Amino acid sequence: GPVWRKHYITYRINNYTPDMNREDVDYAIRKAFQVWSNVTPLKFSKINTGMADILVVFARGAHGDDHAFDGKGGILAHAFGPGSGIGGDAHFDEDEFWTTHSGGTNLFLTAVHEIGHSLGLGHSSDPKAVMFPTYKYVDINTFRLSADDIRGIQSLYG
Ligand SMILES: O=C(NCc1ccc(-c2ccccc2)cc1)[C@@H]1O[C@H]2CN(C(=O)NO)C[C@@H]1O2
Ligand SMILES: [Ca+2]
Numbered sequence: 583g584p585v586w587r588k589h590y591i592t593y594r595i596n597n598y599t600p601d602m603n604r605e606d607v608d609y610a611i612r613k614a615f616q617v618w619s620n621v622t623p624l625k626f627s628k629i630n631t632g633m634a635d636i637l638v639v640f641a642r643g644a645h646g647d648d649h650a651f652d653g654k655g656g657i658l659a660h661a662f663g664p665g666s667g668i669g670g671d672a673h674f675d676e677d678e679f680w681t682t683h684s685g686g687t688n689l690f691l692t693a694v695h696e697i698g699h700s701l702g703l704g705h706s707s708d709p710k711a712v713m714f715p716t717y718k719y720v721d722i723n724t725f726r727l728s729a730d731d732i733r734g735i736q737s738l739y740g
């Protein structure tokens with residue numbers, strides 16, 4: 583499927599969840615991008631205004647893309663593959679309670695998965711992969727991609 587055809591990729595945080603400190607949202611998202619730039623030639627930069635490749639949005643219920651959220655639980659987030667417009671964008675369900683830790687739903691871990699989609703990855707059947715469909719908390723301080731995730735992303739980039 584589609585991939586980004588350039589190495590410098592921008593993201594913009596459209597709005598911030600009230601669930602977390604602003605700086606913690608910034609850091610979680612930055613770290614999640616870093617997971618993927620660690621294993622590809624991609625470079626990610628946060629921009630404050632204008633058109634970014636990847637728009638990060640927090641929203642609940644119906645939010646303008648025909649892919650409505652479902653309240654607390656269930657769908658935690660979704661993201662669109664590389665392309666113009668909404669392509670690349672990552673949306674996080676505001677009806678979740680986002681955190682920096684094991685409580686609620688961990689933003690960093692969810693963002694690693696969603697950014698995988700923003701870069702062109704689909705779901706993996708391997709329960710050890712970050713691209714596995716099911717959320718399960720793992721210690722964020724020592725988090726690592728599975729071999730399957732690395733094979734997947736490196737088949738697309740680098
Ligand atoms: O948003 C999701 N998932 C995104 C997601 C997947 C995996 C991780 C993940 C977290 C930690 C480690 C590895 C992967 C994070 C977010 C949800 O998981 C599936 C099934 N599902 C569900 O059963 N919810 O109760 C709805 C939706 O689709
Ligand atoms: Ca939900």
Ligand SMILES: [Ca+2]
Pocket residue numbers: 634635636637665666667668669670671
């Ligand atoms: Ca976009």
Ligand SMILES: [Ca+2]
Pocket residue numbers: 599600601675676677678679680
């Ligand atoms: Ca919330």
Ligand SMILES: [Zn+2]
Pocket residue numbers: 645647649660673
């Ligand atoms: Zn959406």
Ligand SMILES: [Zn+2]
Pocket residue numbers: 695699705715
């Ligand atoms: Zn997914």
